[PDB]
């Protein structure tokens, strides 16, 4: 968000996060604007910082989004931590073996995984991951649309598992998460594969709940989120035990109920 004109420091319900903004495109004018932002992970960060008494001057990532081993050099938050440029990478980060091999992780707190986003235009629709249809879809009806994005997490797993589905899915590539949803609503897209948690959140507060995920709470590649940490950093045990205590005492559940709640979802 941006600082409101009235008492222009920030709203009393969030934390200032500095960021890098480039004026226009050609001009590399790096006016490091001061703005304040909220969400989910920041709440856990505040709670953790209260119980571990450490200060922080956090900044957004500049080049690229998420992380990828592009030409043996990583961009995004992974590139920062792998270069010892910024301890902690709090955000929606998926646990992966290559990621774990490169940079240490902590234990998860919120579970998620691969989910299938196919709904009824007007008995489960597909209910199959290694199904008959999406294993050789060329010679079965007109080909279905795939929701996928370059430099992600699900696409790499699908490619290394069976590239043929990835080979066809390279035909359809989206730019933004809302772009794929808009195309699906407009009819240009039919199926979307992405992280389970974000798809669940989007479908929960959908306007009218016209779209329902393919499976009734079924996941394929169950793997929770986490926070990246510098290899050998003297923070692992403290933060790990702290958030284990947090999940034990039910603060995470309360925060999920307050935040991770849909519009209709179960209200049917």
């Amino acid at each position: 968000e941006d600082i409101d004109p009235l008492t222009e420091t920030c709203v009393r319900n969030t934390v200032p996060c500095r960021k890098f903004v480039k004026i226009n495109n050609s001009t590399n004018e790096g006016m490091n604007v001061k703005k304040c932002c909220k969400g989910f992970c920041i709440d856990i960060l505040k709670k953790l910082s209260r119980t571990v008494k450490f200060t922080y001057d956090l900044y957004l990532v500049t080049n690229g989004k998420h992380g990828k081993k592009v030409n043996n050099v990583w961009n995004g938050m992974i590139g920062e931590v792998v270069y010892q440029r910024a301890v902690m990478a709090v955000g929606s980060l998926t646990i992966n073996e290559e990621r774990s091999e490169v940079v240490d992780f902590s234990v998860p707190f919120v579970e998620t995984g691969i989910s299938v986003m196919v709904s009824r235009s007007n008995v489960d629709q597909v209910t199959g991951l290694s199904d008959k249809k999406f294993q050789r879809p060329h010679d079965y009806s007109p080909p279905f649309r795939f929701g996928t994005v370059p430099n992600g997490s699900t696409e790499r797993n699908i490619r290394n598992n069976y590239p043929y589905m990835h080979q066809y899915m390279t035909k359809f590539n989206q730019k933004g998460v809302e772009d794929a949803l808009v195309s699906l609503k407009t009819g240009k897209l039919d199926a979307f594969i992405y992280d389970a948690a974000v798809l669940n959140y989007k479908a929960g507060r959908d306007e009218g709940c016209k779209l329902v995920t393919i499976g009734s709470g079924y996941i394929f590649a169950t793997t929770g989120y986490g926070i990246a940490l510098q290899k050998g950093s003297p923070w692992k045990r403290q933060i790990d035990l702290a958030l284990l205590q947090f999940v034990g005492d039910g603060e995470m559940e309360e925060l999920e109920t307050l935040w991770l709640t849909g519009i209709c979802h179960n209200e049917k």
Partner: peptide
């Protein structure tokens, strides 16, 4: 079919909507 809204305690009244 329509339900009575339980004030702000109602989550629907908790989350504003364009039609509300």
């Amino acid at each position: 079919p329509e339900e009575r809204i339980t004030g702000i305690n109602d989550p629907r009244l908790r989350n504003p909507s364009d039609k509300f």
